[PDB]
Ligand binder design. Structure first.
Ligand SMILES: Nc1nc2c(ncn2[C@@H]2O[C@@H]3COP(=O)(O)O[C@H]4[C@@H](F)[C@H](n5cnc6c(=O)[nH]c(N)nc65)O[C@@H]4COP(=O)(O)O[C@H]3[C@H]2F)c(=O)[nH]1
Lengths: 171, 171
């Protein structure tokens, strides 16, 4: 349905272009340690706050990842921005990674509240699931994701910082 | 179909957030003249190059518009970038505006070349048209677009700089 298109937009205009350069940007930050993979949080309830630190205080913002620039569809040197977070566990830095929500899920939530979008509020979870299922299929066949990306789907029924650490510790 | 979702993504996560601040950013640039509207080019053939100057040399890049920052889905101070262009006509500056292609049309073109996207190459024009028709409906009912945005649909069968100037001169 709609989720099918946003998943492809998410990969065409973002992951396909910045994943090939992520390791290089992480290397640049360490010297001039952060983990070598982009962690994407996929709350299937489509509850995407704009500040990760408020969804969980154990997720502490640290610094910005070095910018990436690319001439895109008439915008000269368009900036792409990522955020580096520290994950605390009983007041102890247990990890550090490039962490972010999947913005398109936030778009699904908004589409559902607009009247003329023809998107009922009950179809959120079904679309969030189809978005996750469509993205996994793409990245399983994507060379850009040569072990450079990890998805974190979950359904708040709970510590989000613990869920991130679980995947991070297995790295 | 697919175009319906990208048009809403285009408005939810971009135009709805940066149009309320465009005039202020243009004001800041003039003093610290540029036109007071964002011009979006919608080539219905989905031919979106990344450098406007090459689609037409009479379109000359000038400078960057002052950045806009916003906490978005876990990315602290995410930068939004626009480009200011000069439109030449027989070697004379005939206009100056914030000009850019509609990136989502570029995404439609790419989706059509990927095999697993289930998007045939022949459906481009139909989707580019549905994208334009869905965006016009949104902006006709959008308060954010309080005479702050102008769409430029066209089908290359021709001077793109002349097409932009035609809309710009009527402003
Ligand atoms: N973390 C991070 N994620 C990023 C970054 N860039 C993209 N993504 C992800 O990829 C999705 C699809 O990106 P696009 O194919 O480019 O389609 C965009 C584009 F057409 C327009 N748009 C957005 N920002 C700007 C801008 O600064 N300047 C101009 N001129 N246009 C802009 O709005 C559409 C929907 O944006 P949205 O944010 O909802 O979904 C994005 C987002 F999820 C990034 O820097 N950082």
């Amino acid at each position: 349905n709609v989720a099918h298109g946003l998943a492809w937009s998410y990969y065409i205009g973002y992951l396909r272009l910045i994943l090939p350069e992520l390791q290089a940007r992480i290397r640049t930050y360490n010297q001039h340690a952060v983990s070598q993979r982009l962690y994407i949080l996929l709350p299937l309830d489509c509850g995407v706050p704009d500040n990760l630190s408020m969804a969980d205080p154990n997720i502490r913002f640290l610094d910005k990842l070095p910018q990436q620039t690319g001439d895109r569809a008439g915008i000269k040197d368009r900036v792409y921005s990522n955020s580096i977070y520290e994950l605390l566990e009983n007041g102890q830095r247990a990890g550090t990674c490039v962490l972010e929500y999947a913005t398109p899920l936030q778009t699904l939530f908004a589409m559902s509240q607009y009247s003329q979008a023809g998107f009922s509020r009950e179809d959120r979870l079904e679309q969030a699931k189809l978005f996750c299922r469509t993205l996994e299929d793409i990245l399983a066949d994507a060379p850009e994701s040569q072990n450079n990306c990890r998805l974190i789907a979950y359904q708040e029924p709970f510590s989000l910082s613990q869920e991130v650490l679980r995947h991070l510790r297995q790295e």
